[PDB]
Amino acid sequence: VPISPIETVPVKLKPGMDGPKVKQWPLTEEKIKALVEICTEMEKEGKISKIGPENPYNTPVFAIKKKDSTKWRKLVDFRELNKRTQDFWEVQLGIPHPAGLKKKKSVTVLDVGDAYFSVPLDEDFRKYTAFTIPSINNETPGIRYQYNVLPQGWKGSPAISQSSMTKILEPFKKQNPDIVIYQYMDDLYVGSDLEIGQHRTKIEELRQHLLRWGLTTPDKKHQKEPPFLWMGYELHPDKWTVQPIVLPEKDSWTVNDIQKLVGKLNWASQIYPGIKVRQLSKLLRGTKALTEVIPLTEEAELELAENREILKEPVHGVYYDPSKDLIAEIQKQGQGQWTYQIYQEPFKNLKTGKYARMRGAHTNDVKQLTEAVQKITTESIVIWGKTPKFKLPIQKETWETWWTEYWQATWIPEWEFVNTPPLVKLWYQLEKEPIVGAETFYVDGAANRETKLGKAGYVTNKGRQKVVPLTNTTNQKTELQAIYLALQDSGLEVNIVTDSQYALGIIQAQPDKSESELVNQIIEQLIKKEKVYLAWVPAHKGIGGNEQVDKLV
Amino acid sequence: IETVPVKLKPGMDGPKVKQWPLTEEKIKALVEICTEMEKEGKISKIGPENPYNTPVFAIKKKDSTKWRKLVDFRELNKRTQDFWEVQLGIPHPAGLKKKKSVTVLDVGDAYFSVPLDEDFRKYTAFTIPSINNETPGIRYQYNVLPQGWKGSPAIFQSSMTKILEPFKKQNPDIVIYQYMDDLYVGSDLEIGQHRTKIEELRQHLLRWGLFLWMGYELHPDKWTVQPIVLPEKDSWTVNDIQKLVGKLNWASQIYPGIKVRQLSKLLRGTKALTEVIPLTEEAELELAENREILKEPVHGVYYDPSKDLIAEIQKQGQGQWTYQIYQEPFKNLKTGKYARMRGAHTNDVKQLTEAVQKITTESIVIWGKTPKFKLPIQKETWETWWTEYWQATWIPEWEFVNTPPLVKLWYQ
Numbered sequence: 001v002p003i004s005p006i007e008t009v010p011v012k013l014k015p016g017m018d019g020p021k022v023k024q025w026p027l028t029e030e031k032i033k034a035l036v037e038i039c040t041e042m043e044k045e046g047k048i049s050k051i052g053p054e055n056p057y058n059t060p061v062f063a064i065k066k067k068d069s070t071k072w073r074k075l076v077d078f079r080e081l082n083k084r085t086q087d088f089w090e091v092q093l094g095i096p097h098p099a100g101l102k103k104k105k106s107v108t109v110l111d112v113g114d115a116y117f118s119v120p121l122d123e124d125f126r127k128y129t130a131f132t133i134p135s136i137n138n139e140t141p142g143i144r145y146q147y148n149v150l151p152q153g154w155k156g157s158p159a160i161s162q163s164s165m166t167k168i169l170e171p172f173k174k175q176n177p178d179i180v181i182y183q184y185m186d187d188l189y190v191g192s193d194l195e196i197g198q199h200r201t202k203i204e205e206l207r208q209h210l211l212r213w214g215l216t217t218p219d220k221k222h223q224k225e226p227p228f229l230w231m232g233y234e235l236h237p238d239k240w241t242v243q244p245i246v247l248p249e250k251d252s253w254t255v256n257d258i259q260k261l262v263g264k265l266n267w268a269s270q271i272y273p274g275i276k277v278r279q280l281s282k283l284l285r286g287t288k289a290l291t292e293v294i295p296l297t298e299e300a301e302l303e304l305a306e307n308r309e310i311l312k313e314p315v316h317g318v319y320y321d322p323s324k325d326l327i328a329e330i331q332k333q334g335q336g337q338w339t340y341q342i343y344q345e346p347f348k349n350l351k352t353g354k355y356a357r358m359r360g361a362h363t364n365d366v367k368q369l370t371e372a373v374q375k376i377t378t379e380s381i382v383i384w385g386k387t388p389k390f391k392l393p394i395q396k397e398t399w400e401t402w403w404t405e406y407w408q409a410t411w412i413p414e415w416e417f418v419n420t421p422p423l424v425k426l427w428y429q430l431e432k433e434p435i436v437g438a439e440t441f442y443v444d445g446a447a448n449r450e451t452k453l454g455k456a457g458y459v460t461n462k463g464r465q466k467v468v469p470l471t472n473t474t475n476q477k478t479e480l481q482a483i484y485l486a487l488q489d490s491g492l493e494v495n496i497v498t499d500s501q502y503a504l505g506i507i508q509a510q511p512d513k514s515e516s517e518l519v520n521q522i523i524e525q526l527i528k529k530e531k532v533y534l535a536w537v538p539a540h541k542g543i544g545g546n547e548q549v550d551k552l553v
Numbered sequence: 554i555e556t557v558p559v560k561l562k563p564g565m566d567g568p569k570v571k572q573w574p575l576t577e578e579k580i581k582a583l584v585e586i587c588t589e590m591e592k593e594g595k596i597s598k599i600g601p602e603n604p605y606n607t608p609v610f611a612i613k614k615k616d617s618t619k620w621r622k623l624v625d626f627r628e629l630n631k632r633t634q635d636f637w638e639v640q641l642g643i644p645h646p647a648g649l650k651k652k653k654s655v656t657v658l659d660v661g662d663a664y665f666s667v668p669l670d671e672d673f674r675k676y677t678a679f680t681i682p683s684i685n686n687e688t689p690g691i692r693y694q695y696n697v698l699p700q701g702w703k704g705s706p707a708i709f710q711s712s713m714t715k716i717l718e719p720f721k722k723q724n725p726d727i728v729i730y731q732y733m734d735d736l737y738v739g740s741d742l743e744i745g746q747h748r749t750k751i752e753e754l755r756q757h758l759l760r761w762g763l764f765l766w767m768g769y770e771l772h773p774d775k776w777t778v779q780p781i782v783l784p785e786k787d788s789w790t791v792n793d794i795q796k797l798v799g800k801l802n803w804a805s806q807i808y809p810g811i812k813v814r815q816l817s818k819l820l821r822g823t824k825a826l827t828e829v830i831p832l833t834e835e836a837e838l839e840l841a842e843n844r845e846i847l848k849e850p851v852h853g854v855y856y857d858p859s860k861d862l863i864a865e866i867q868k869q870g871q872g873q874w875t876y877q878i879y880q881e882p883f884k885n886l887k888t889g890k891y892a893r894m895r896g897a898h899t900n901d902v903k904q905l906t907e908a909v910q911k912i913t914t915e916s917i918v919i920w921g922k923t924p925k926f927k928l929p930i931q932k933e934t935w936e937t938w939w940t941e942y943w944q945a946t947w948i949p950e951w952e953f954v955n956t957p958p959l960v961k962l963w964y965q
């Protein structure tokens with residue numbers, strides 16, 4: 001029976017480069033004995049061909065009988081050629097995620113490593129594939145060979161192999177919109193929610209289709225029993241979880257030692273809810289060494305226990321069901337940490353996750369919620385191709401107040417309020433107009449850059465004044481301290497006037513938590529006030545208290 | 554025999570740009586779209602030997618019910634060496650911005666017949682991604698001139714001319730411009746007139762062989778750069794003088810002559826913010842001469858084709874947005890405002906996108922080179938959603954502001 005050919009993909013070397021010329025290895029007679037044995041199997045199969053020395057190129061052949069398994073196998077080292085081989089479209093980018101998989105009633109695994117091996121290689125490129133088998137004792141010319149197919153280990157083989165199979169299967173997939181054909185590694189995964197009988201037909205049919213290019217494919221990928229250890233997960237018939245995590249109990253924690261502790265707990269978080277990572281992570285930012293023991297902030301070793309507590313109870317996620325809806329829930333873990341669960345039916349998660357506050361000086365709960373939300377949106381689109389409906393611990397009224405007033409443009413997709421403390425809320429709000437009858441505090445700070453000595457103080461309309469001396473301070477800290485004094489000495493309602501653009505900025509961002517326990521005490525004062533109006537004015541025009549406070553030098 | 558070879562700049566290789574995640578709705582829509590484009594030879598499936606890639610996405614066109622394919626060639630256009638005239642004098646149409654009305658017509662689908670140079674085609678590669686990365690993406694490249702590529706109009710340009718001269722002769726006054734997929738035509742004609750005027754070009758064009766049944770009418774009467782105004786009040790409180798002194802100080806950055814000494818002098822003291830202060834004559838005059846300088850324009854404010862145009866946007870609240878365009882700080886080439894009620898008063902991101910488009914269109918018309926935007930929005934928030942509201946064929950460049958300017962109020 002005549003067979004359809006598998007058209008070849010044109011391949012080229014990089015810009016102005018040429019084939020590899022790597023002299024061959026000195027082998028064992030025994031190995032040479034093998035390589036010859038092997039290349040002869042290959043010659044007949046068409047996989048390779050004998051060539052004249054007129055062919056300039058060469059690539060070193062290695063040989064290895066492996067691990068107590070008598071079988072001898074050939075192994076070319078195209079490392080060089082690869083480095084001189086063009087770039088192809090990458091098959092690598094991204095990893096499918098379990099929570100995204102859509103199960104089928106019937107699924108058959110076909111071994112297609114053989115078709116792979118029957119994929120013709122570009123003619124003009126075969127030349128650069130040449131390799132030489134040394135002769136016994138060096139007394140004869142080595143045997144010259146070049147591939148006629150995609151050589152194992154070469155750069156362009158996985159891609160072109162996959163690409164060529166995508167093409168052969170294309171028509172089949174179409175003429176049978178009902179089934180699904182997946183391509184991973186050297187196998188084909190055929191699934192369908194069809195009658196046990198019909199499925200086998202469809203397989204038989206697939207087989208007929210692949211035979212048109214002379215490829216015979218047996219249900220050959222070694223049959224294994226669930227669960228399948230795929231990329232760090234356990235894929236059970238109806239549920240998935242990650243393969244077990246076991247953490248180090250040593251007292252000699254090093255950078256690698258901890259760097260390692262991160263990679264596993266984070267991995268664990270996609271399914272196990274509530275795994276904190278901040279603490280153990282915190283001291284790592286200020287480091288460059290990966291080989292020494294490390295101490296432990298207690299808040300850091302306790303969490304390890306929390307994680308451990310969470311980790312002793314088996315936790316599984318589900319597979320995806322397109323008809324059912326997609327829902328995500330967020331909770332505040334506390335301390336700039338958050339956690340979430342994405343699911344379809346309650347008390348059955350597809351997956352879980354965490355979001356940690358980006359590194360910034362100051363911040364607020366709403367901004368973080370928002371970020372956690374975009375992250376989940378993005379992740380969800382990647383995995384299911386759609387945004388879930390959000391259930392957030394924040395009142396519709398709070399969100400509305402916030403965004404209408406926020407200076408940036410911000411947005412949360414369709415979401416509904418969920419009454420689960422701790423609720424995310426706004427802690428204070430600055431007035432929009434001055435406050436009649438409230439004392440006006442003209443505050444002012446300053447530091448001498450050289451001496452590092454400054455004064456922070458205020459003067460009011462009621463005649464109240466104060467200047468406080470500070471040492472080891474900046475022209476910025478003085479400005480914030482001054483605002484802090486005003487907040488401390490004023491009553492429940494207060495009008496504050498600064499010239500500090502720096503101060504204005506921090507406070508006009510409405511943070512509810514900062515790194516400066518200074519900005520952090522100010523926030524606390526703000527929480528306690530009933531009405532705070534913060535105004536800004538230009539410096540050195542000698543105005544108000546900043547001027548009366550300015551002359552105090 | 555129909556193509557014109559083309560290249561890239563020295564040391565400038567094809568685009569290798571990551572495709573971003575799409576929604577299942579958009580993918581199914583790009584699939585359908587792309588199948589038909591194949592049936593008509595517009596684009597073809599390509600092998601793994603093509604490394605290059607450009608992002609692509611789907612939208613619902615201006616006043617539309619159908620999905621449309623959008624390709625982000627921003628990177629490919631920065632790699633494209635524009636083609637030039639052989640006589641040095643080279644003009645952008647100043648007249649279009651000077652004309653009363655400007656009507657934009659989408660002439661992109663015209664390019665769908667004209668072939669693309671073989672040794673360049675590989676460069677228009679793009680991928681329809683799969684969901685959750687289960688399957689390998691579906692890849693293609695263009696066989697014909699692609700919508701979104703700016704080296705695309707340059708080619709059809711000395712050809713469109715032919716298609717346009719049967720009009721230019723007839724209506725000697727009208728001005729006609731072209732930026733990407735659209736034709737910009739303006740006239741000093743009465744609306745009823747100018748409107749019916751376009752169907753004449755809109756029709757006479759189909760005879761030349763030739764979606765295109767929607768309405769967007771545009772006019773330039775505004776201030777080139779809106780002037781700064783101070784408030785008029787009968788009684789001024791300390792807070793008013795302070796805000797005033799503030800605004801003026803900011804303005805003296807632009808108008809050197811702004812003095813606020815006599816206006817500052819009343820501020821001396823430590824009076825309650827809400828206290829009424831009576832105005833002096835020393836500071837009235839100060840306020841008088843200040844208003845005058847504000848009526849008059851900035852000196853020597855030149856445009857310069859060598860620098861890029863920067864557009865800034867401020868969210869003022871209640872669907873109101875102010876914005877400024879310039880190349881030199883404090884040298885506005887144009888200001889404006891978008892206070893429209895056509896976009897969501899419930900969606901910031903949606904409003905901003907519209908803001909950016911209108912400001913982009915205004916830019917092309919005045920200088921022919923879109924602005925470099927400075928967005929009042931967290932980077933992540935914008936890229937996550939902006940594409941869900943984009944309705945235009947082109948895409949500007951944009952940075953991101955993360956610190957709130959004090960100048961917000963000074964604009965509205």
Ligand SMILES: Cc1cn([C@@H]2O[C@H](CO[Si](C)(C)C(C)(C)C)[C@@]3(OS(=O)(=O)C=C3N)[C@H]2O[Si](C)(C)C(C)(C)C)c(=O)[nH]c1=O
Pocket residue numbers: 096101102103104105106107109180182183184189190191192228230235236237238319687
């Ligand atoms: C790793 C792996 C996957 N699959 C199946 O292949 C498809 C995907 O491949 Si995989 C994961 C290699 C990839 C990366 C998406 C191509 C699959 O079939 S489906 O049509 O019912 C839908 C699928 N998703 C998998 O089923 Si399930 C693991 C969901 C099972 C629990 C047996 C029903 C196996 O049968 N065995 C395996 O070892």
